[PDB]
Structure formats: structure tokens, C-alpha cells
Design an enzyme around this catalytic site. Structure first.
Site, short mmCIF file in Angstrom:
data_model
loop_
_atom_site.label_atom_id
_atom_site.label_comp_id
_atom_site.label_asym_id
_atom_site.label_seq_id
_atom_site.Cartn_x
_atom_site.Cartn_y
_atom_site.Cartn_z
N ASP A 180 0.87 -1.21 0.00
CA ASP A 180 0.00 0.00 0.00
C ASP A 180 0.90 1.24 0.00
OD1 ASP A 180 -2.45 -1.49 -0.06
OD2 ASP A 180 -3.34 -0.18 1.44
N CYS A 214 -1.94 0.63 -13.29
CA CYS A 214 -1.88 0.48 -11.81
C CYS A 214 -2.51 1.66 -11.06
CB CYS A 214 -0.44 0.35 -11.34
SG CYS A 214 0.50 1.90 -11.46
N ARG A 220 4.27 2.99 -10.04
CA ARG A 220 4.38 1.59 -10.54
C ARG A 220 4.52 1.64 -12.07
NH1 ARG A 220 -0.04 -1.32 -6.31
NH2 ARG A 220 0.75 -0.19 -4.49
N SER A 221 3.79 0.78 -12.80
CA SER A 221 3.70 0.69 -14.28
C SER A 221 5.01 1.12 -14.96
CB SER A 221 2.52 1.48 -14.80
OG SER A 221 1.29 0.90 -14.39
N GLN A 261 7.00 8.27 -10.55
CA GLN A 261 6.44 9.27 -9.60
C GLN A 261 7.38 9.62 -8.43
OE1 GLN A 261 2.42 9.31 -7.74
NE2 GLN A 261 2.89 11.41 -8.35
#
Ligand code: WV0
Ligand code: WV0
Length: 281
Positions: A180, A214, A220-221, A261
């Protein structure tokens, strides 16, 4: 060599600084179609908008828009579609895109619920005997089989074009164990995930591009595509250590905003490529 560059940034704690140089060097292109008022609800709020030049177009005469980008990595001969997690109102559009681009694989790097909110609609069926029909796009989707592992699940789906009665098999690769908050401690299970996607033939030139997503934010991704591309370029270069992650990230960044990110994701991407290398080389 990136391993030595790793220890340097790590021992100096300069991850936020490297990342900011990337943020500052990164391409900015128009995204005019994404901002049209008629596309506000086709757009996941607090998610990146696709550049007009690399955006996937739906073949519907009405509204051709989906939040999806084609990443084309010329040297590596690899192409990826990166998209947001579908919304309740774009599930039909998502499967139309899979159909129209001749994708074999869908790669999902999020849970449907994380941090007590829905990151994504439930866009595939949970039982064999309860298939989904998307009336807006004239498609039917059936769960054929499901293979649940510790770190990921692989599903075989049948997508049927109700208009022409053609059918195709789609593989759903669902990494279920991304935490998370933050990034996995070790990249081992993520690497075993990539190799899985590779051995399926889903990333091969004989198919349309893989669809990767995602949710919205986190990142992610980006990590998935960046690791795949960096490893394959090491299989191609006379000198595997000519491969600069930062350069590869900036190339992909020409096609879609909002990869990597966070500085943590950047660090994890280095660690995934470094450990993937040693496994192959
Ligand atoms: C590199 C190469 O030399 N041949 C080939 C075929 C498919 C790829 F995805 C990448 C390469
Ligand atoms: C790997 C696995 O564990 N399950 C599955 C199903 C289809 C494939 F093509 C690959 C795999």
C-alpha cells in the site's frame, strides 16, 4: 556501471536530487484531447493525461478518447500501452482498446482496493459461469482459468467480438503484493513477475502491445516498462554497461507523463535492473 552509481547516490542519499533533475529534463507536450469537457468523466481524476501525439484512439466514430499512451522503444523493438485503471464507465472502452490493438497480455500492478479506496473497477469476471457483456462496445469476456500464486495471479480470459463472433485469448497478469505504501523491499518477486509475462509471449512482436496499468498516482507501471526495456537493451549492446536508466526513462517520458512518480520508485527500478542483470549476466 550503474551498480557503482547506485552505491554513490545511496551512500550520498541523493535520490530526491537525481529524481528532480529527471522531473526538470522531462518532455512536456500538448494534451488537448484529454482536457476537452466531453472527456472529463472518461478521465480518472488525479491521474496523468495522455499527450495528443502518443494517445491510443478508439475506432468508435462518436468519441475516440481513452486515457492510454503508446510507448515505442525503437532500439529494444518493444512497445507498451500504458493506461489508467478503468472507471465503471470506461470498462467497455478498455476492452475495445485491447481488442482493436491485438494485445495478448494485460499487466495489472495494483489491488482493486488499496488504502480503503477503489483504485480501479472490477473489469474482469470472478467466476467461470458469470461472464461480463459490455453492451456499449459489443464485447463478451469469460474467465477460462485462474492460477493463484503467492505474489501474483495469472488468468486466461476469452474476449469475444459479439459483432463478428471472433474470439481471442487474453492473459491477465495481476501482481497482487505491491505494498500500500512504498516499494517491495527486494525486487525478486517483481522480476519473477516480468520473466513470467516474457515467457507467455505477451511482450513479443507477433502480438499488439501489452496493456500495463496500476490505478492513478503512486507510480508503478513505469517501473515495469523501464526494467523490461533496460534488461533487453543489455541483450543487444556490445557493451551492456553503456545502458543509462536515466536516459531510458527520459525517452519513455516523451510518450507519457507520470512514470517513477517517487525517488523510491526510481531507486527500486535501479535495484530491479541491477538484480535482473546479475540473474541473466
Ligand atoms: C533485437 C534483435 O536483434 N532482434 C529482435 C527481435 C525482437 C525484439 F523484440 C528485439 C530484437
Ligand atoms: C503461468 C502461470 O502460472 N499460469 C499461466 C497461464 C497461462 C500462461 F500462458 C502462463 C502461465
Amino acid at each position: 556501471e550503474m551498480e557503482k552509481e547506485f552505491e554513490q547516490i545511496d551512500k550520498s542519499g541523493s535520490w530526491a536530487a537525481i529524481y528532480q533533475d529527471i522531473r526538470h529534463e522531462a518532455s512536456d507536450f500538448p494534451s488537448r484531447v484529454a482536457k476537452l469537457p466531453k472527456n472529463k468523466n472518461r478521465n480518472r481524476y488525479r491521474d496523468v493525461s495522455p499527450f495528443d501525439h502518443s494517445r491510443i484512439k478508439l475506432h468508435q466514430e462518436d468519441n475516440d478518447y481513452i486515457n492510454a499512451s503508446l510507448i515505442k522503444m525503437e532500439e529494444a523493438q518493444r512497445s507498451y500501452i500504458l493506461t489508467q485503471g478503468p472507471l465503471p464507465n470506461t470498462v467497455g472502452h478498455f476492452w475495445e482498446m485491447v481488442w482493436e490493438q491485438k494485445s495478448r497480455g494485460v499487466v495489472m500492478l495494483n489491488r482493486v482496493m488499496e488504502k480503503g479506496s477503489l483504485k480501479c473497477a472490477q473489469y474482469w469476471p470472478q467466476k467461470e459461469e458469470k461472464e461480463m457483456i459490455f453492451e456499449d462496445t459489443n464485447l463478451k469476456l469469460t474467465l477460462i482459468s485462474e492460477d493463484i500464486k503467492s505474489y501474483y495471479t495469472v488468468r486466461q480470459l476469452e474476449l469475444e467480438n459479439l459483432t463478428t463472433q471472433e474470439t481471442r485469448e487474453i492473459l491477465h497478469f495481476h501482481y497482487t503484493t505491491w505494498p500500500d505504501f512504498g516499494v517491495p523491499e527486494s525486487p525478486a518477486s517483481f522480476l519473477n513477475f516480468l520473466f513470467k509475462v516474457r515467457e507467455s509471449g505477451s511482450l513479443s512482436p507477433e502480438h499488439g502491445p501489452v496493456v500495463v496499468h496500476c490505478s492513478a498516482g503512486i507510480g508503478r507501471s513505469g517501473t515495469f516498462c523501464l526494467a523490461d526495456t533496460c534488461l533487453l537493451l543489455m541483450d543487444k549492446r556490445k557493451d551492456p554497461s553503456s545502458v543509462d536508466i536515466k536516459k531510458v526513462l527520459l525517452e519513455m517520458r516523451k510518450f507519457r507523463m507520470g512514470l517513477i512518480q517517487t525517488a523510491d520508485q526510481l531507486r527500486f527500478s535501479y535495484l530491479a535492473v541491477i538484480e535482473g542483470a546479475k540473474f541473466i549476466m
